[PDB]
Amino acid sequence: MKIFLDTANIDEIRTGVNWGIVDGVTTNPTLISKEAVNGKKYGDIIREILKIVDGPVSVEVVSTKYEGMVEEARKIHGLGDNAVVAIPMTEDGLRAIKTLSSEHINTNCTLVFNPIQALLAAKAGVTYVSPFVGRLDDIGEDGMQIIDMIRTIFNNYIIKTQILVASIRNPIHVLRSAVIGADVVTVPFNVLKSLMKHPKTDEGLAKFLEDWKKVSPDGKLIL
Amino acid sequence: MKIFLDTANIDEIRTGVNWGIVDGVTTNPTLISKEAVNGKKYGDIIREILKIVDGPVSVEVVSTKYEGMVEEARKIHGLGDNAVVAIPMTEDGLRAIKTLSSEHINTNCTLVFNPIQALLAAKAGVTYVSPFVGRLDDIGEDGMQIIDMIRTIFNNYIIKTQILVASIRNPIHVLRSAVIGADVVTVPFNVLKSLMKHPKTDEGLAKFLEDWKKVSPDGKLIL
Amino acid sequence: MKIFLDTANIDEIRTGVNWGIVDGVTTNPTLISKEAVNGKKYGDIIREILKIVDGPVSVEVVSTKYEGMVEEARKIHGLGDNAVVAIPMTEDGLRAIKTLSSEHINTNCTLVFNPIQALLAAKAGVTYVSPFVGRLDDIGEDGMQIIDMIRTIFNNYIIKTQILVASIRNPIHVLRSAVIGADVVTVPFNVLKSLMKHPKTDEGLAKFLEDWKKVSPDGKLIL
Amino acid sequence: MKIFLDTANIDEIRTGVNWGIVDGVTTNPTLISKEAVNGKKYGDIIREILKIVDGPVSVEVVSTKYEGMVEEARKIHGLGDNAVVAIPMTEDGLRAIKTLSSEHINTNCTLVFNPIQALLAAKAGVTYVSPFVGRLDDIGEDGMQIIDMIRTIFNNYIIKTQILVASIRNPIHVLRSAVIGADVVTVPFNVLKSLMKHPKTDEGLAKFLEDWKKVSPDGKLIL
Amino acid sequence: MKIFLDTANIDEIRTGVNWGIVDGVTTNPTLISKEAVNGKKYGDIIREILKIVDGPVSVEVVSTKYEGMVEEARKIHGLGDNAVVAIPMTEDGLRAIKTLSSEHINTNCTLVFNPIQALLAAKAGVTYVSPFVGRLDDIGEDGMQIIDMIRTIFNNYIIKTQILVASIRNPIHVLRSAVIGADVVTVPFNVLKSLMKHPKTDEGLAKFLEDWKKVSPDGKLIL
Amino acid sequence: MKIFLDTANIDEIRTGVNWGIVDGVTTNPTLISKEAVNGKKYGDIIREILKIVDGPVSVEVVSTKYEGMVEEARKIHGLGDNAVVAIPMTEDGLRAIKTLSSEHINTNCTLVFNPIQALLAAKAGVTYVSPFVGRLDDIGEDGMQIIDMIRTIFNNYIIKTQILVASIRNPIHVLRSAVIGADVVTVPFNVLKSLMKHPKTDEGLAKFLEDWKKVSPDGKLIL
Amino acid sequence: MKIFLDTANIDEIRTGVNWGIVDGVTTNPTLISKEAVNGKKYGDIIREILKIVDGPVSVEVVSTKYEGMVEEARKIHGLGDNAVVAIPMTEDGLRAIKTLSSEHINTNCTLVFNPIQALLAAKAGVTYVSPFVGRLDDIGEDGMQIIDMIRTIFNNYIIKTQILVASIRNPIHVLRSAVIGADVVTVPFNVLKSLMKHPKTDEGLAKFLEDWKKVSPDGKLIL
Amino acid sequence: MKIFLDTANIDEIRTGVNWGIVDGVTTNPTLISKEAVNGKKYGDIIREILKIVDGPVSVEVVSTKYEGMVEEARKIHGLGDNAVVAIPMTEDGLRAIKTLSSEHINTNCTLVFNPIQALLAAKAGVTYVSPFVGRLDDIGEDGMQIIDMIRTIFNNYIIKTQILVASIRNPIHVLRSAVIGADVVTVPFNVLKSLMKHPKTDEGLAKFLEDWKKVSPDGKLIL
Amino acid sequence: MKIFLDTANIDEIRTGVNWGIVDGVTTNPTLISKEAVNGKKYGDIIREILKIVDGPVSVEVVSTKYEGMVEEARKIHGLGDNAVVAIPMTEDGLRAIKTLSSEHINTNCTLVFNPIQALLAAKAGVTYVSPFVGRLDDIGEDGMQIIDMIRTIFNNYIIKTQILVASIRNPIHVLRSAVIGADVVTVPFNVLKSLMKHPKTDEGLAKFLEDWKKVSPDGKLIL
């Protein structure tokens, strides 16, 4: 499972990228809008992310119309080989995805909320489909179930579209995604850092440190 | 499923290896601290285990910082081709693992307590991930469930990182590990011994031997 | 699933073999003791079974010590290519199996009562492992569960050791072994006989014969 | 799944075969004896069926002894390439099947009532095994469960013997057989007749016809 | 679970009732038509069954119109307190059932083929609902599933309408009905007889009787 | 399970009410708006339905504000004892429901789309909660699952609020509701009439009719 | 769960009763024939068992005809209040049970091999029904499944007939009966003995005694 | 299931209470510290909450020592009858709870992270136990599983301690709590507000409004 | 579920009892023998425990014979009302329990290793039955499964004997016991100590304290 950062915050991304545990980044108009304030240009935001992120960087078109989506997609594409064009799950989006796929421009179909939408996006030739599990959670349905079904459907049809779990709110979304076998999760920074942590890890380390001192007071390992 | 001995006790290791049932050893700073007494130096203990054990011998770094970890890892690695560098599940540890994995130094990510930690370790290129099941048990969480999920996650993504079940407390951790399909269990000596024993084996053998004496007074099998 | 006869009774063996439904034989010191009475020598009994039987014939060592097991194993092995050396699940047994396996001597680890013992035997390189299901039944534990677990464990690690279900008491052990997918069942002769039988088979055959008499008074099929 | 007709009634066979949904025929002494009346000879009935039916035609020996079974089997075999010799599940039958199998004579082990009998028949090399589900139903045991277990057993050991579900009484035996994955069902003609039928098919067809008349009073499709 | 005989055949009814295993009878226009031959009047047949059978005797109205149904139902009801008026699952039938239920005339809603039909019948106040399982089987639908769902639905709402499984074709319909907890099964005579039989009962009794003769030559039990 | 008609069409309601199978009616602004065209006043629509429907008639307030809801609810209430006030699942709705409940005015909380909303409505003291399963189906989630969960939640807390399955589109919604144990379903007229129908009922009746004629050519039942 | 001894061996019975773990005895004509040898009369054996045993003692009629069964039943009944009349599952047996039940004579319907037979026996008013699980095992059918089904059926209809599991061959029949919730198991003496035993019980007791000797050299507990 | 607000924010509480969907409030030292700023005193915040909330209001002791806990507990208790004393899951806490329970002071054992802790709190007589599900989620374990286990455990032992699911992060914690049957959830305000919301509710409401406009231009309901 | 301390260590018992989480104590000859050293007498240890512990205190007889067991049991009983006599699962033990039970002496059947032994003990009237789960774990069998089955068996027959899970090795035995619904667990002190603890409790408490200091530097709660 690939792990992306779901943010437009350059500091978070750079931190996560430095940790070596971020395989890519997904942004979205809202996320970018958070960072493009007080002088910051979304243009520079996107470019910087493209630059410092080795892996796929998803940037969403803003046009709701086919032609505008495809044009914006091409612009996004031209920004860097790692750019992935996020296209919303709409009639025009599916058209755009099919066209972009034919142009070998990587696509991420976003705002997916059920498995059939996911299937449609896959059938359009989308590289990634991004179901928003947290937003399903928000409305009283367990979002992860949609990921499970999409996984099954995609397995059924040997679909190559990657399932990119988005709207991840907590590490259990992440755990469940992994157990289900989703291809990618994209996670907010606060979730990302929580992923490495466990109080028994901290406790274990402290005890290891403590006992090592009995062997070597300076706490070094000389071999 | 491979079976390692989780000890720094040379006699236990020597005994288990002489049984031919020990596929490797895992040490940790605490286990080493138990043996590094009465003048025994940890450097000798480690080198001696490395000598006795054909298979992987996991030796944990003591540094908590990336640079110290890779420096220690390289020194550990220099002790013998069978050395595996145990690195804790920490941000620095993941960075160290990634670095070491590229240097083709075998690693074992230790102090793993949930499946996502294990996944992150695997994604850093770790050779083994060591979830500490007994320590989860200690806190009222069935540790084996984490192994099951890791197995599933690792199977989902054809992850080649080996699941090395650690903090093994009893033969059912071992049984469950095997049924789950964990790659390795590492077990304290008291556990290792227990694994081959069963009262019905003892009873059965005694009966066989008694019955044999009815047909061969000396208890011999002449063929 | 192979069906062995678990007996040293030559008549049973010759009969079973002649029925064509017996793929091998397991003996053990008790079974042999039953036959080696009134002047009958165990050595002749063993040799005769090796003769009558084309399939594997398991003969158990009696030594409890590694050196004696291996010496007796080689003598057993030397009696015929179909000889399989049964080695009890003990520390020395595992060592013996490892050695014998390296000498390409087929082995059968017997007196196995749980799946981890079976795993240890497989790990030592044993050709067959023989869990004793009836004896578990005897102590209020459903022995077949252990076969199920061993099957799973073996499947998990692509273990080629054959599961040879022993201490078979009834046709349901056999049925369940088959459904589980045990490699072999070794059954006493009375169980073997019962396997072919069913009241509806008898009834149906009688009815067929009766109906046929309406069309062929002398009960022949002339074509 | 193949569908055989379980009858010796020539008219039923001709009818079934003309429908094109009959893949073969199974007879048995009772079925044949029912047709071989008022002068009609069983030799003629058998030959006629073999002539009519392109696919396998199962004809059961009547001898209960190995020699007679094998002799009759060879006569049956010589009647046509599609003749399959039905042999009852008995000790002699298993012997006969083993011999016939080595002679590349297709066999069908009949009067099988549990999965272990089926396994024995497979082990004898039988081409088909015929568990009688309706006769189990008759005695208050869900006959199809036996098919399920046989399928599982056969799957376990990659057994090539075809499961030929016999004593089929109703289309649910047929449905369940298909869902289980039995290789063949053999069905009485009245069951065969029902399999193509469904009231909603009838209703849908009539509706289609009625609606079509709105655009083509003469009910034709001119293209 | 009650057991009714599903026949208009006085001899079968007389025989079953003499066995003391028949708790009632269901007739239907067809079953009655089978018996209303050679001058036998349906009125006699019905009255005779009513006379022989202590328990409920279900007699179906022939009218398809509400008024005719209630008129016939009242006449049926007048034939004896044990008469149950069978009314088909139709709009008029439901109206008739509701009316009759208020007049405290027992009713049996027949030709029920799905659980919602059964529910509607129950809601009309019907005493029994008779799903025709064999007729579902006939069309490639496991009829017993409908019984299971009706049982569940009826349990959900504490419905006192009795589930009367009809179109019973075999002893497994009966077995499954009992396991599901259907209130009543109505069975053709051939089925009723079969229900008490089992080859192991026959075999067991024969053996008992043979063994008894060893201790009591005359086969008597003198106490 | 109660069955309501989900319509404002007086003809449908009168037809269903005449069938005797309609326990109540739910209307909604849309449904009423369909009928209140070409002169028809919604006022008369509602009154007529109240009049001809013996059971609960749900009429939805139109105000989105608490006070208006409560006022409209009281008006609706005053229209007849069988009037039930439908209140949408909103903040004001819950307030209105709690107030109306305190006033012993029956309430139906509508536009419920998950189980927690249902729980909230129940906690407000609502008489019925109406999850709209078809509308969930419309958006690619199986609406019946929400009914299942609500049933479980309500069972958990011995909640007396009736689950009123609405947005019913087909008889399987109805079947599943019944199997789940929903208290009520409200169904469109086309669904309602389909509930009584089954082709095997029609076929069975025709056959019964046909065979009865063999007993009585005039097709009468004279008793 | 009651535990009966399935034997006519007085010594076994007296021993079992003295252990206090035997709640009754079932005999059958075979078991009695085993004891009624060398001058021992069945009548004395039966009377003696009735004496030794406080619980129910089942004695089987030998007549196969209703009148003889009932006559023998009354004689059996007349021997003591704890006498239970075993009646085979046959047509005449059911009639006999019905009659005897009406005469408040406790009955045990034996030679039951499927759940519908058991149901029929219960319906006739039988006190116990005795399904023979080992004999089903004998014919390749898991006999315990029949007990499970009977338990369910009996539970469904609140049947008070006690399920008396007979033909018990091993402690797993007993375990499974207990887990299923059979009312009674009747077990041969050798099974009875085995039920109390477990190697870990012996081991634990030996260890306790050994440890206690450290604190009380003469192994007494003096308080 | 009761729904509490997990906050010390008076405005949120007032808002939630005004919505009439808040059954109680839980505070904790952190939540109050958030509000007790800019001159605001924790004493006033607490008192204000108690006055505004009819339901239980949980206020946590700060002492870590038994005596400090019971003294603070009694002070908290004295503040109002609806005050519930929150006591952390510690040895001192259990002691305090037992004392407080005996003094009939309602208690809420907080910082519970596994089911056995919850059981210990229940056994101390705690009124509520508060497992922190989100904080388990935070560390990669599905916190709701703990609730499920506690529910089972409490059900097993008819424990009257209410399960108060805390650390609620999303509506799915809430949904799952209700399905499990937790007695209470305490939710942050943003979760509380989300619970009533669903896009289809909004859509449906808008559509109803729109359609009602067709029949009543002014959008009124006149009756 | 009650929680007993499985020890004869007075200091552990005092400590556990002072925590208020110890409901009783189980001793056994090994445990007692461990304490009864360096002059300390077992009579004194036993008496001291009985004095210290308010709840049941289990003390095991050492006699292996009925008379000795009963004699010792009565001495144990006379030591205090809370004394429970532990009796091993043996033939004599069952006899002793039956006698002691009739004398209203509370008993604990120990060294139980399967569910049927447990059932026998219950049938003897034992107050508690103590299956030893850790010792089953020791021999590669999941000990808790025995508890699950015993619970089921006991539930089936409404058995009042308390399931006292012994040989508890870890908190998961405890957790599983609680989830299964065992009446009692008896745990070694080190397990007892762990049950109250969780790292997140510690972490949460520290955080609560830290945050509280923001509103109360002295860390007090003045109300």
UniProtKB/Swiss-Prot annotation, chains A, B, C, D, E, F, G, H, I:
SUPFAM superfamilies per record? Aldolase
Q: In which pathway does it act?
A: Carbohydrate degradation; pentose phosphate pathway; D-glyceraldehyde 3-phosphate and beta-D-fructose 6-phosphate from D-ribose 5-phosphate and D-xylulose 5-phosphate (non-oxidative stage): step 2/3
Q: What compartments host this protein?
A: Cytoplasm
Gene3D superfamilies attached here? Aldolase class I (3.20.20.70)
CDD domains per the UniProt record, alphabetical: Transaldolase_FSA
Q: What is its main location?
A: cytoplasm
**Alphabetical keyword list:** Cytoplasm, Pentose shunt, Schiff base, Transferase
The molecular function terms in GO held by this entry are: aldehyde-lyase activity; transaldolase activity
Protein name listed in UniProt: Probable transaldolase
Q: Per the UniProt entry, what species is this protein from, by scientific name?
A: Thermoplasma acidophilum (strain ATCC 25905 / DSM 1728 / JCM 9062 / NBRC 15155 / AMRC-C165)
